[PDB]
């Protein structure tokens, strides 16, 4: 039932400053009712959680997504002598699967880390602590972590997506080389193994075309670009 809160463009990721306007502070939080001052330490605890997790999460997500995306794209575009369609589709799929892996990877570590940061901030500023105020503290840090996890994740997901594209480009350099080499010897690239299999074993109705991929068959890959997990889908503005 719940849609994502942000669009891809709603969050600028060039700097950790992009996080501040979106941070949400439930005014009913008991710890906040008692010391409205502690609201001041939230932004920095969040920014430091993101700062410590962004690069491991980005690195791991791209690494998981890379192999899967390279193999499938290589497979789907095997009889496609052009490098243009392949590059775009690989772009869309890689960016999408990376964002998904990023979302799966950082959520629970973000919760833990944001909660930990807030408590320690809370416990240092005010001041001193108390058996009924540490309960407000841990209530506050847990709920705030929950309330800000989507924003923190989105930040990290977007960082991963921006980096993913050029990594896929580098990974597919030889594929682009195969198609470029062939054109210079005056011919279309066609994977010989795939050409044979498709011609001999695949039913006509579902065969990869030597003669090209019907624009309708590309619906999957367009959808990867349209609908990225953790963000509002794209439209015709």
């Amino acid at each position: 039932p719940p849609q994502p809160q942000y669009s891809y463009h709603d969050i600028n990721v060039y700097s950790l400053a992009g996080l501040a306007p979106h941070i949400t502070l439930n005014p009913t939080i008991p710890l906040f009712q008692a010391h409205p001052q502690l609201k001041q330490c939230v932004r920095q605890a969040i920014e430091r959680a993101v700062q410590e997790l962004v690069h491991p999460v980005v690195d791991r997500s791209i690494k998981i997504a890379m192999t899967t995306c390279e193999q499938i794209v290589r497979k789907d575009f095997a009889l496609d002598s052009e490098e243009s369609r392949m590059r775009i589709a690989a772009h869309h799929m890689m960016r999408n699967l990376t964002a998904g892996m990023a979302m799966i990877t950082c959520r629970e570590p973000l919760l833990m880390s944001i909660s930990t940061n807030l408590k320690n901030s809370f416990a240092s500023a005010l001041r001193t602590a108390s058996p009924q105020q540490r309960e407000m503290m841990d209530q506050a840090a847990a709920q705030l972590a929950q309330d800000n996890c989507e924003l923190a994740c989105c930040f990290i997901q977007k960082t991963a997506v921006e980096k993913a594209g050029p990594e896929m480009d580098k990974r597919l350099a030889t594929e682009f080389e195969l198609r470029k080499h062939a054109r210079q010897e005056g011919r279309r690239y066609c994977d010989p193994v795939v050409l044979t299999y498709q011609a001999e074993r695949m039913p006509e109705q579902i065969r990869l075309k030597v003669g090209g991929v019907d624009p309708k068959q590309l619906a999957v890959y367009e959808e990867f670009a349209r609908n990225v997990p953790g963000f509002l889908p794209t439209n015709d503005l």
């Binding site: 799929m93 999408n96 799966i104 959520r107 109705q205 579902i206 068959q217």
Partner: protein, 269 residues
């Protein structure tokens, strides 16, 4: 050739999100009457990418756990198609090379006890199950680098009887492989974690019989006793329920498991 042309059309209709849900349903029903469904799915354009799309698109519903019955039914039709690909001699290796099981691990990691999540987990387990049934060493080697053992152990402890059974069977296949036995027995921490979980399961089985689950638990112990270090630790920590007559009655039909239990005891001398 009338019903087969019906299959080609659903396959083509998997690419577009407008016709995909329906094609998922219809194809998942036909997979025991279409022997070559797997290479057709694998080798057609955009199909595997569409199934992966189905998987990744429910990631937002995983955490926080808001997955519905309908969402779960839909993605499980996709998973059912992928299980078909994991089983087939012609598609297994490429399925594995594409690392597709990794996009299932986020499902195996969920802990929500609602039926949409339990079905999700069971169906995901079924894909890994299909893989190890083939008895390929390549499969085991992939599973060992990808850390599916802790995932399986958590499920063996807390899942439905069905999920526990599939998860234990996966562990069993890994153990039966020489590399898998060595890996799990490589450190006391690893071996201890596994033994501890098997011990808990044995206790739970003594209160609620499951022939199938008990069989796989026993096979795991038996295989563990092929390792000299494990054999020594098992002498000390083997559950008493596996030594007395706790399970005699549920086993008198199952000669195979009886025989296995018998050799386990004999090995520990």
């Amino acid at each position: 050739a009338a019903d087969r042309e019906k299959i080609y059309q659903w396959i083509n209709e998997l690419s577009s999100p407008e016709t995909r849900e329906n094609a998922l349903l219809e194809l998942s029903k036909k997979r025991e009457s279409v022997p070559d469904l797997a290479p057709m799915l694998w080798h057609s354009f955009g199909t595997i990418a569409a199934l992966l799309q189905e998987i990744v698109n429910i990631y937002p519903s995983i955490n926080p756990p808001t997955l519905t019955a309908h969402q779960s039914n839909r993605v499980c039709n996709a998973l059912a198609l992928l299980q078909c690909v994991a089983s087939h001699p012609e598609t297994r290796s490429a399925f594995l090379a594409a690392h597709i099981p990794l996009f299932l691990y986020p499902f195996l990691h969920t802990v929500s006890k609602t039926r949409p999540f339990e079905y999700l987990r069971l169906t995901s387990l079924g894909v890994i199950g299909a893989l190890v049934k083939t008895d390929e060493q390549e499969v085991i080697n992939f599973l060992l680098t990808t850390e599916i053992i802790p995932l399986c152990l958590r499920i063996m402890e807390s899942g439905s009887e069905l999920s526990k059974t599939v998860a234990t069977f996966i562990l069993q296949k890994i153990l039966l492989d020489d590399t898998g036995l060595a890996y799990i027995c490589q450190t006391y921490e690893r071996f201890s974690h596994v033994a501890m979980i098997l011990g808990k399961m044995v206790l739970q089985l003594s209160k609620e019989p499951s022939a199938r689950l008990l069989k796989h638990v026993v096979r795991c112990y038996l295989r563990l006793s092929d390792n000299p270090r494990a054999r020594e630790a098992l002498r000390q920590c083997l559950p008493d329920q596996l030594k007395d007559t706790t399970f005699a009655q549920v086993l008198k039909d199952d000669t195979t498991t009886k025989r296995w239990l018998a050799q386990l005891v004999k090995n520990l001398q």
